[PDB]
Amino acid sequence: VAGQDGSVVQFKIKRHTPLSKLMKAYCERQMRQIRFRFDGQPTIDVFQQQTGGSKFSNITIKNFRNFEKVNINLDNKNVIFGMNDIGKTNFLYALRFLLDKEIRKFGFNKSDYHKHDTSKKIEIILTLDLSNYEKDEDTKKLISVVKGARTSANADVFYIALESKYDDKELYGNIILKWGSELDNLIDIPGRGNINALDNVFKVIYINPLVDLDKLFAQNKKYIFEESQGNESDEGILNNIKSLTDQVNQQIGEMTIIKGFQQEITSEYRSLKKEEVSIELKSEMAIKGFFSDIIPYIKKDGDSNYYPGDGRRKMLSYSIYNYLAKKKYEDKIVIYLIEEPEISLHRSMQIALSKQLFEQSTYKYFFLSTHSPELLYEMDNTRLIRVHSTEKVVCSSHMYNVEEAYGSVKKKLNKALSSALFAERVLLIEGPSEKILFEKVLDEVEPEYELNGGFLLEVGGTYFNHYVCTLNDLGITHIIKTDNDLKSKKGKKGVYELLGLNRCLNLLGRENLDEITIDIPEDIKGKKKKERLNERKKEIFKQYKNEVGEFLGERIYLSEIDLENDLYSAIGESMKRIFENEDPVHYLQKSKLFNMVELVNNLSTKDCFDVFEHEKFACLKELVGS
Amino acid sequence: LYALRFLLDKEIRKFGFNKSDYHKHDTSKKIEIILTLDLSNYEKDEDTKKLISVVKGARTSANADVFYIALESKYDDKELYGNIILKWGSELDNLIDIPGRGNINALDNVFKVIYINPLVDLDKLFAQNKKYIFE
Amino acid sequence: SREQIIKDGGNILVTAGAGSGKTTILVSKIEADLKENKTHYSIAAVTFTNKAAKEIEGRLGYSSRGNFIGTNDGFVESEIIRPFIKDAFGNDYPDNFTAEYFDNQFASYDKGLQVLKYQNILGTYSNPKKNFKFQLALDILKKSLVARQYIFSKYFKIFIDEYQDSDKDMHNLFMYLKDQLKIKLFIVGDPWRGAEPENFNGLIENSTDFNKYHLTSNFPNATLLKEVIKYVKIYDLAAEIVGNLSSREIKEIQKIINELLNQVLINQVLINLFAKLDTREITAFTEV
């Protein structure tokens, strides 16, 4: 059973057993308010009644193209990504079929059924939350249209279902929309002619990367200028312009060359057919008015010229979308389906679009399908949906949030994590020194590990909880290679906290161990102090060997002392030879960045394979996938 | 020909009416396309029985001879859309909406409009029908 | 005047005289509010006379906003009773009943309520002073949560005319829609079978929240005999009759009316016509 706030509880399952006892146990740990749902039907998700959450709870897709049976949790802002490109495209289409009138009116072909098996029926069910009825105005928009399809018992939940059974006689699949608070019985959505009640409440705006700007301004220019009021000065100017355009047409007819042509072509037409007509050359705008051909112009400041820059036009096309979003639709719920915005978009503009999607409130509800990590640089309070590489189309969903503790490092944290989302196996390392060594070792051993799905994500100064929880929920394999560290508390002497051990324990869900005290003489300094700490680290590692065994099961590899000591065990003679020093480990730790580069330069292929095959560096084998 | 397609062809009707489809582009005026049918030869004509079976209770015994199929559309200035609503019945003054589920309505079961255009690829034509022709 | 009443958006008392400004103010105020409000909310206009409902609707014209224009009894049936009867009272109660008020009268609420379930038809009350339909609608709103949610989410202002003719039960429901459901009210009262003049007159003196506005004049049963007289010289006269009138009752009324078309037979048809729902009035009918 998975909680709404990310809490996970484990329970024992018994055969031929009602679920009521499990429901009672969960309620006692935390009944009428809560609702229990399994795979979109009433791990088990829970519904905590009046909470601050999205209207959209989850969507179920059955027998639609790729999706044999898929249930995906949702939120206001949803990002879908993954290797399965057809799965991502079909997911967006399933939303369009449910909510977009233009897509729905075409019906379902034979290809739209799973495995082209028209015997099975297509079902697309969207579950909504109406608990925050008074806080949310969009909930009131839906309730007003729905009217009596709801029940007071189930006033918090609502379903919008799409059903389609193929007609072999007519070679046609008819889409029938139903809705209601009870999933077992749903009434048909009322409608007259082409439109139904659902089209009044839901507006789907499909943003495609290849959108002509002037085309976009063409349709919306009508609303933008009729919605606003017109004072006396505007009316006088409007009439004055009409006079000016009329004079332009009159002056055109006064030219000798134009008058000569239209007289000649009139005689030519009269000879063709004896009809009492005349031909005039008039300006098209002056006939239709200035409104017909008005278009936006990018004007550089200090420059008189008007320019019809492609990138400038691409970005401003979103400004119109932002402008309309503020005031175009105040009477309906607007859902934006943004598909591959990064196509032919500079990475700096991708970050700009990322800030609009997540930081701003312009796009309250959207589904974003992306292939570029840059669009996720500002991601926050969004639901991440990952389509697995398998052809079976499995979808893993995680509700991404950044806590207040991570608020100061949110920018750095998001930039690193965004690239890891597009990977199969992620190895969590500490700093660049680990990255330098592992990149060299992997280069000599498995040079195309990045192609296969490997990724080296470096995290420093923070607990692994944020990264692991996101990666685990999305179905991405995570490997943690950390080292046993002792951190001294500020203002207190001789006492250290097992920072390295605590981070791994926090991953397991256990509480942090208490700080331990280490007694050293004042004379003991430098190398003598360091080796004393190493002795304590070795003792602590032995003492908690049971926990270390648990870490290995969870793909957490904790070094006994640090990476350098583990590296020395794997290649001692080689490291000692090239470092030409009595104690290579101490020298390597003096300047970690520069000495590691020097060590990596002098490493041979045999040494790299020795590191790869060593027991301590088992994380490399896990990352490779062997 | 388009007025006939809008009334009887599902594929044309599903697109609705643009602003250009209204006379003089005058959105205020409503579009009406009414087809009057004769059902007097009920027993002689099998196609009359095809229509009567679908129509069911929309008829009246007083007007059992005449039937009307009406297309009505009023432009929506807010949505920039002209919705097409089909009505039918034996009495012209009061016509009930043609019942339907989803995209199809009762009228699409009885009437089939085959639009023969002057240019048509033969194999393109044979591709559709070869399914039915042999199954 | 009219300008100040347009600007005000709260509860407004209109006290127009002679009935000249009723429809004119209503249509103007509705148009101003609809054009000003860009949200999803809509308005509901309720009129005692069905004729006033269509004549009002004509002036607003076609609109997809979802506004409701109709009779007072048609409002509760279409918006409150029919959709939410089952939710408030269980699935046993029906929602396909077509209300009529010329048959199956009820003695009391504890008698009218349960007989409603079996008959599958809505019956009026033998006592004009109390209206069973509106207290039932009020009861549904109190019992059903979704009904309360729908009303709040659908309508932001209610337009009511001829509030001097409003029943006490009707006033009770409209007050309920105002105070706990936080819905703006626009009532109109000129200084119906069970008309209660107390509620409208008492509203002006007691309700401090309401704003009283007076519209200048220039800017009883006989009226129910004019349309039948010109009809002699059937749906049009039903539109003048207060409330939604069932077609079944039309067939019974029409045979009485066509019987009129000597003096003696003129008198007795008006006797039963008045019974179904003046000494000088019958003489006036004899003259015409």
PDB file of C-alpha atoms in Angstrom, chain A residues 32-35 47 49 149-158 181-182, chain C residues 86-88 91 143-149:
ATOM      1  CA  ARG A  32     -14.898   6.518   5.377  1.00  0.00           C
ATOM      2  CA  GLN A  33     -12.700   9.446   4.319  1.00  0.00           C
ATOM      3  CA  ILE A  34      -9.980   7.242   2.824  1.00  0.00           C
ATOM      4  CA  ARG A  35     -10.492   5.350  -0.432  1.00  0.00           C
ATOM      5  CA  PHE A  47      -7.190   8.649  -1.288  1.00  0.00           C
ATOM      6  CA  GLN A  49     -10.179  12.884   1.026  1.00  0.00           C
ATOM      7  CA  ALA A 149     -24.388  12.686 -12.625  1.00  0.00           C
ATOM      8  CA  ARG A 150     -22.811  12.820  -9.151  1.00  0.00           C
ATOM      9  CA  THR A 151     -23.828  11.164  -5.889  1.00  0.00           C
ATOM     10  CA  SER A 152     -23.543  12.749  -2.454  1.00  0.00           C
ATOM     11  CA  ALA A 153     -21.915   9.571  -1.132  1.00  0.00           C
ATOM     12  CA  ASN A 154     -19.081   9.859  -3.684  1.00  0.00           C
ATOM     13  CA  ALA A 155     -18.944  13.654  -3.891  1.00  0.00           C
ATOM     14  CA  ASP A 156     -15.134  13.572  -3.752  1.00  0.00           C
ATOM     15  CA  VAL A 157     -14.416  11.319  -6.742  1.00  0.00           C
ATOM     16  CA  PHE A 158     -15.482  11.497 -10.375  1.00  0.00           C
ATOM     17  CA  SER A 181     -19.220   9.387  -9.485  1.00  0.00           C
ATOM     18  CA  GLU A 182     -19.737   5.605  -9.413  1.00  0.00           C
TER      19      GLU A 182
ATOM     20  CA  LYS C  86     -32.845  10.209  -6.034  1.00  0.00           C
ATOM     21  CA  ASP C  87     -29.663  11.314  -4.265  1.00  0.00           C
ATOM     22  CA  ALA C  88     -31.557  13.093  -1.483  1.00  0.00           C
ATOM     23  CA  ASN C  91     -33.132   5.460  -5.624  1.00  0.00           C
ATOM     24  CA  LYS C 143     -30.410  16.760   2.352  1.00  0.00           C
ATOM     25  CA  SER C 144     -28.242  16.448  -0.776  1.00  0.00           C
ATOM     26  CA  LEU C 145     -24.669  17.724  -0.751  1.00  0.00           C
ATOM     27  CA  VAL C 146     -24.199  17.467  -4.520  1.00  0.00           C
ATOM     28  CA  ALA C 147     -27.376  19.494  -5.060  1.00  0.00           C
ATOM     29  CA  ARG C 148     -25.974  22.273  -2.875  1.00  0.00           C
ATOM     30  CA  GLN C 149     -22.629  22.099  -4.677  1.00  0.00           C
TER      31      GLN C 149
END
